[PDB]
Design an enzyme around this catalytic site. Structure first.
Site, short mmCIF file in Angstrom:
data_model
loop_
_atom_site.label_atom_id
_atom_site.label_comp_id
_atom_site.label_asym_id
_atom_site.label_seq_id
_atom_site.Cartn_x
_atom_site.Cartn_y
_atom_site.Cartn_z
N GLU A 73 0.82 -1.21 0.00
CA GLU A 73 0.00 0.00 0.00
C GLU A 73 0.85 1.26 0.00
OE1 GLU A 73 -2.04 2.07 3.80
OE2 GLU A 73 -2.18 -0.12 3.92
N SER B 115 -7.91 6.02 7.35
CA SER B 115 -8.49 5.60 8.62
C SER B 115 -7.52 5.93 9.74
CB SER B 115 -8.81 4.10 8.61
OG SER B 115 -9.58 3.74 7.47
N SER C 231 -0.17 7.11 8.10
CA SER C 231 1.20 6.67 7.87
C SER C 231 2.04 7.86 7.45
CB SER C 231 1.29 5.60 6.77
OG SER C 231 0.67 4.38 7.16
N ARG D 190 8.91 4.14 6.09
CA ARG D 190 7.75 4.55 6.89
C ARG D 190 8.27 5.00 8.25
NH1 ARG D 190 3.61 2.78 10.59
NH2 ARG D 190 1.50 3.36 9.91
N1 ANP Z 1 -17.50 9.45 1.62
C1 ANP Z 1 -16.66 9.10 2.73
N2 ANP Z 1 -16.98 8.04 3.51
C2 ANP Z 1 -16.22 7.69 4.56
N3 ANP Z 1 -15.12 8.41 4.88
C3 ANP Z 1 -14.76 9.48 4.14
C4 ANP Z 1 -15.54 9.86 3.02
N4 ANP Z 1 -14.97 10.95 2.49
C5 ANP Z 1 -13.89 11.24 3.21
N5 ANP Z 1 -13.75 10.38 4.23
C6 ANP Z 1 -12.63 10.41 5.17
O1 ANP Z 1 -11.58 9.72 4.56
C7 ANP Z 1 -11.09 8.76 5.48
C8 ANP Z 1 -10.55 7.57 4.73
O2 ANP Z 1 -9.47 7.91 3.89
P1 ANP Z 1 -8.77 6.87 2.94
O3 ANP Z 1 -7.49 7.53 2.46
O4 ANP Z 1 -9.69 6.38 1.82
O5 ANP Z 1 -8.45 5.68 3.96
P2 ANP Z 1 -8.43 4.11 3.78
O6 ANP Z 1 -7.44 3.77 2.65
O7 ANP Z 1 -9.83 3.58 3.57
N6 ANP Z 1 -7.86 3.57 5.24
P3 ANP Z 1 -6.37 2.86 5.48
O8 ANP Z 1 -6.52 1.34 5.44
O9 ANP Z 1 -5.94 3.26 6.89
O10 ANP Z 1 -5.33 3.37 4.44
C9 ANP Z 1 -12.17 8.51 6.47
O11 ANP Z 1 -11.59 8.10 7.68
C10 ANP Z 1 -12.86 9.84 6.53
O12 ANP Z 1 -12.28 10.68 7.49
C1 7DQ Z 2 -1.17 1.07 7.33
C2 7DQ Z 2 -2.37 1.63 8.07
C3 7DQ Z 2 -3.56 0.67 8.06
C4 7DQ Z 2 -1.96 1.99 9.49
C5 7DQ Z 2 -1.96 3.32 9.90
C6 7DQ Z 2 -1.57 3.67 11.18
C7 7DQ Z 2 -1.18 2.67 12.07
C8 7DQ Z 2 -0.76 3.04 13.48
C9 7DQ Z 2 0.76 3.08 13.62
O1 7DQ Z 2 1.48 3.21 12.70
N1 7DQ Z 2 1.32 2.94 14.92
C10 7DQ Z 2 2.72 2.97 15.11
C11 7DQ Z 2 3.09 3.97 16.18
N2 7DQ Z 2 2.35 3.64 17.44
C12 7DQ Z 2 2.93 3.84 18.73
C13 7DQ Z 2 2.16 3.58 19.87
C14 7DQ Z 2 2.79 3.79 21.12
C15 7DQ Z 2 4.11 4.24 21.11
C16 7DQ Z 2 4.83 4.47 22.41
N3 7DQ Z 2 5.35 4.64 23.40
N4 7DQ Z 2 4.75 4.45 19.99
N5 7DQ Z 2 4.16 4.26 18.82
C17 7DQ Z 2 0.88 3.58 17.26
C18 7DQ Z 2 0.49 2.77 16.05
C19 7DQ Z 2 -1.16 1.35 11.66
C20 7DQ Z 2 -1.56 0.99 10.38
MG MG Z 3 -5.44 3.81 2.48
#
Ligand code: ANP
Ligand code: 7DQ
Ligand code: MG
Ligand code: ANP
Ligand code: 7DQ
Ligand code: MG
Lengths: 352, 352
Positions: B121, B175, B178, B190
């Protein structure tokens, strides 16, 4: 005059009071009734009014301070009740710190002839922390860590020696969070801060659960399951995200499962309290970890009253800091909790 | 087969579709009815079912890709509705990324003879971002910033040249969040992530306000006053905290005024929505700022669908990153929002 130091924070007032125990027969004659009245009131009660508390377990006994022997007492009450404190005082040289030393300066001056000396909240924190660790906690270590924090069957509180404390990252978790890099007794900087602190925990909990106190919020959190509210890595990947070493149990999105109406309808108040605690605590640990890495500091000490009677957050910080830093950082804690600024203020008395 | 790339996230599926526009008369004869049916369905509709949307304004027209000319289309739908998408598909080589490429691998294989190729991703994000900036947005800049972000009467969107994009900090707000440090086309890491992301905004808003969509939450937030919920520096100090350069308007404790019952009883849903937005956005900006400083990178680009139709958060990031970095960091934004991973996946097609 009585020897006080006061730290007036955004939520709590902390007061350190030095009770002399080497009073001579002549000194007892020469002391005025109001002075005897204050000493008796403070030392014969552990609850003051409806909201003041003396933390008796923290008392430092037979401390030598300013050439006198005495007991150092630790007292707290809500800043919301400072008007009651000042009214009691109206019907002394006060070294005061925290934001309220400035905010309520004009109120303290309603107490006649009282001399207020405002001191910096982070200067007092550093001076008080170094002082209490130097004198010890009645012969025991003031500083501790959680040994083997990654293993629940082994995890246990252990004393930690801070004889040569520098450098040190100090993470002060109050209403909000200040992060300090301390290089010597007189050389430190406020690296940054975060507004996701103890007030966010208490404020969000109150909105989400209807809890009416910090202690109630922690009790709810101890019974909850934060994964009912949080979206985990395994909820997005079906497992670990192996390429970047993210375990499936890591939180990907705090409160992220609350975007689904059916999940909002099944989550419990206890689950929400625990998710709030986990969200705030992990964010503080992560910011601390980033600051420690940039400052090239490997000892991180967490203070402030977000952590009082809060073993959940302490153990989460111990585990998370160790896990996410691959064992390179150690989480340290101090028995004196939220009182360092008040002690540092008291230590400023000789300058006046 | 049709040329698709798909990014299956924790909340949204993003699909990039290449529509050939150089079809010869012989090629039109040789194409099977189902293939013509898909092309017609995708290009003659802008809403698909009840929850799929084509973002027509983002279309790249007359792009040369894999030696053919065509239009690049951008389509999104909730991950919750992927079962409907797969059922439509059952009654092709698919390059897929995001966590759902793994989570739903077995589901995609219910489509007979369909060949699924899972791609990383963050690799796809980087490749898609660099590709779209390289080809331009139909001759306009793909990247923009807010000029004079500290001055409301002057603040305006302006194009920004990324011809030599390295190094670059990429902050992907989905959600969860990163954060990537990109040093070359094939060298990135990352740096960290945070779980306080777009899902925290949407999930907390839903709990606090009863909003039923992302767009509704933003509408509420546009009408609210976050200072009704947040505790500011001036609420603790009575003004600025001068010694450490903290202005009185800075948030000291997010939601920190919600520890008082009377304030919880007067705060509006709109106030709570805006406080949620401000809390999440400032935390993302602060983590980005700390990462940029440690990585010695001064250009920070924010992507992900938390920022789609969200000028409030974009302007807050632009202002906050500039203010708190003393002008040393610049916030950058990209027109393509949340689609870079889907484009990067499509670009992997020649490897299969
Ligand atoms: N129509 C929508 N429905 C739901 N969320 C939305 C919408 N438009 C914007 N958002 C926002 O966009 C976010 C999701 O962004 P997005 O970049 O698509 O994440 P994702 O790829 O689904 N999640 P991840 O697995 O963490 O990468 C949500 O958490 C909302 O804050
Ligand atoms: C790839 C997408 C789905 C994704 C986005 C976001 C995350 C959350 C994340 O990346 N993390 C790392 C850093 N984290 C902490 C936590 C405590 C301490 C202390 N003390 N330090 N770091 C928190 C969770 C995971 C996955
Ligand atoms: Mg995403
Ligand atoms: N009895 C209590 N009442 C209120 N909050 C408590 C109590 N016990 C622990 N807390 C927590 O402790 C936090 C306050 O910590 P504290 O270190 O006293 O901050 P403060 O000095 O008042 N604020 P600040 O101005 O930001 O330094 C609260 O935000 C709560 O999370
Ligand atoms: C001393 C006590 C009362 C106190 C604690 C805590 C705070 C909050 C704080 O210290 N800050 C600085 C860092 N902040 C941001 C924000 C956005 C970006 C971007 N982009 N960067 N930094 C956020 C507020 C203030 C005061
Ligand atoms: Mg304080």
């Amino acid at each position: 005059s009585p020897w006080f130091g006061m730290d007036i924070g955004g939520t709590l007032v902390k007061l350190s009071y030095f009770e002399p125990i080497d009073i001579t027969a002549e000194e007892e004659q020469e002391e005025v009734e109001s002075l005897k009245s204050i000493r008796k009131y403070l030392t014969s009660n552990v609850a003051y009014g409806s909201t003041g508390i003396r933390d008796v377990h923290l008392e430092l006994k037979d401390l030598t301070l300013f050439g006198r022997r005495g007991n150092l007492h630790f007292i707290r009450f809500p800043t919301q009740d400072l008007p009651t404190f000042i009214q009691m005082g109206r019907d002394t040289v006060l070294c005061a710190t925290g934001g309220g030393a400035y905010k309520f300066e004009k109120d303290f001056r309603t107490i006649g002839n009282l001399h207020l000396h405002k001191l910096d909240e982070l200067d007092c924190l550093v001076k008080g922390l170094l002082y209490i660790d130097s004198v010890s906690f009645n012969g025991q270590a003031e500083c501790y860590y959680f040994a083997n924090a990654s293993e629940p069957e082994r995890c246990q509180k252990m004393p930690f020696n801070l004889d040569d404390p520098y450098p040190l990252l100090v993470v002060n978790i109050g209403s909000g969070v200040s992060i300090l890099a301390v290089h010597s007794k007189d050389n430190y900087k406020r690296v940054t801060g975060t507004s996701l602190g103890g007030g966010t925990f208490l404020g969000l909990c109150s909105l989400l659960t209807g809890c009416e106190s910090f202690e109630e919020a922690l009790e709810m959190a101890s019974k909850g399951d934060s994964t009912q509210a949080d979206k985990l890595v395994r909820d997005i990947y079906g497992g670990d995200y192996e390429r970047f070493g993210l375990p499936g149990w890591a939180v990907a999105s705090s409160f992220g499962n609350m975007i689904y109406k059916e999940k909002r309808e099944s989550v419990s108040k206890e689950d929400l309290a625990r998710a709030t605690l986990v969200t705030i605590t992990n964010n503080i640990g992560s910011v601390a970890r980033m600051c420690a890495v940039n400052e090239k500091i490997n000892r991180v000490v967490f203070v402030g009253n977000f952590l009082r009677v809060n073993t959940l957050s302490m153990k989460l910080l111990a585990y998370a800091l160790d896990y996410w830093s691959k064992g390179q950082l150690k989480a340290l804690f101090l028995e004196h909790e939220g009182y360092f600024g008040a002690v540092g203020a008291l230590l400023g008395l000789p300058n006046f």
